[PDB]
C-alpha cells in the first residue's frame, strides 16, 4: 500500500552489463609461490611496491592485466613517463580501497 517498489522492462533485465565478459577473458588464477622462489627485483630493475612479487605474478599482473584493463600497451616500461608515476600511486589507492573501505 505504500507505493514503494522499483519498475523495470524484462528485456532490460535479461541484458547483462556487456563488460562482464571482457573481464572474464582477461583474468587468470594466482600461482602459489614455492619454497624460496625468485622475485621480480632479483630479475629486473623495478619499483618497491611491485618488487617482492615473484616473476610469474609480476607477469600476470603487469601485462595480462594492467595493460589490458587500461588500454595502455606499454605501461610501466619507461620508469620516467608520467603514466608509470600515476599507475604506481593507483596501485596503492586500489589496495587501500579494498583494505580500509570493506
Amino acid at each position: 500500500g505504500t507505493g514503494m517498489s522499483v519498475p523495470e522492462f524484462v528485456s532490460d533485465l535479461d541484458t547483462p552489463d556487456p563488460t562482464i565478459e571482457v573481464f572474464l577473458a582477461s583474468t587468470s588464477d594466482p600461482v602459489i609461490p614455492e619454497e624460496g622462489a625468485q622475485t621480480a627485483g632479483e630479475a629486473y630493475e623495478n619499483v618497491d611496491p611491485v618488487l617482492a612479487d615473484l616473476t610469474v605474478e609480476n607477469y600476470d599482473r603487469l601485462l595480462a592485466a594492467m595493460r589490458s584493463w587500461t588500454g595502455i600497451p606499454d605501461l610501466l616500461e619507461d620508469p620516467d613517463h608520467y603514466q608509470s608515476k600515476v599507475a604506481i600511486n593507483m596501485i596503492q589507492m586500489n589496495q587501500t580501497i579494498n583494505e580500509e573501505w570493506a
Partner: protein, 325 residues
Amino acid sequence: PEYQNIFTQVQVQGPAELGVDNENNLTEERTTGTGFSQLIGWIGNAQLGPIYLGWFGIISLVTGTLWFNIVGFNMLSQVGYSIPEFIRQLFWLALEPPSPEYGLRMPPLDDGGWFIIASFFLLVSVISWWLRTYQLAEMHKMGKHVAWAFAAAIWLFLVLGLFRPILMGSWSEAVPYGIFPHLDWTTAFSIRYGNLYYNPFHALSIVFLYGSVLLFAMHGATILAVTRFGGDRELEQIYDRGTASERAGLFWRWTMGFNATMEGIHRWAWWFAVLTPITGGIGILLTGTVVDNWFLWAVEHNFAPDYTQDYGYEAYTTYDGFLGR
C-alpha cells in the same frame, strides 16, 4: 441517436452588436471595429470585439508588458544574446529571487534587484485590473461578485509573493519567474517543511478544488440535458419558473435526496471556487512562521499512520532472483 447539442448545426449572422448603454455613457470609451469567426461559432458566439479602454486597463497593460520584457531581456542576456540557444532552453531559464544573506534590504541588480523592480510592476498591473473589474460593474449597475471572486485569488497571489516573505524576514522566500524553475520551487517548498500533504489547509484546498470540478461536470451536463425545454436561458427561468428547472431539480432530488434551485446552484459554485485560494493562503501563511515540520505536527496530533512490515528489498526478494540469474 438524438442530437446532443455539442456542435451547432447551422449558423446565422446579422449586424454586429455594439452593446447596451445608460446614463454613464460607456460608448465614449469603446473601440469601433468587430470581426466574425466561423470556427469558434461551432461551439459559442462568433463575434469578436469590441472592447472597453479605460485608464485602469491601459495602466495594467503597460506595466505588465514592462514586467514581461524585464524578465525576457534578462533571460536573453543570461545566454549571451544567442537566439537559437534562447529558444532551445526557454523552459529552463528564469529570473531568480535574491540571496538569503540580504534580508529585506535592496539587493544588487545582479542578485535580485531586477527581480524586485519587475515584481513592483506586476503588482501594480494586477491591482489595476481589479479596479477595472469593480468599476465596470458599478458602471453597468450590476453586483460586485466578479471583483470579489478575483480578490479571492489575489489573496493567495499576495500571500505567496508579498506577505510571507515580509513575515519571514527575507525577499529570498519568493517564487522565481520560470516554467520549470517554478515547479522546482513547489517541490523544494514541500520537501523543506516536512510533507505538505499533512498540512490540514492544503487538504481543505484540495477538497474544494475537487468539489469545484465535480460541480461543473454536474452542472454542465445537467444544463445540456434540459436544453430541449429552454434551459440555457437561466435568467428568465429565475424570473418565471418553467418545466426545465423543475425537471433539473427533480433529477437530483430523486438521485441523491436533495436538490437546488436555478438561482441557488450558482451560489454553490461561487463558494466552492472561491474557498480554494482562501484556505490555500491560510495554509501557506502558517508554514515556517508557526509550524516547521508538518509530519511531526501530525504525529503530535495523532493522525499519522503506522506500518508493521519491514523496509528493504531483501526482506522480500533477492538481487539474483530479480535479474533471472
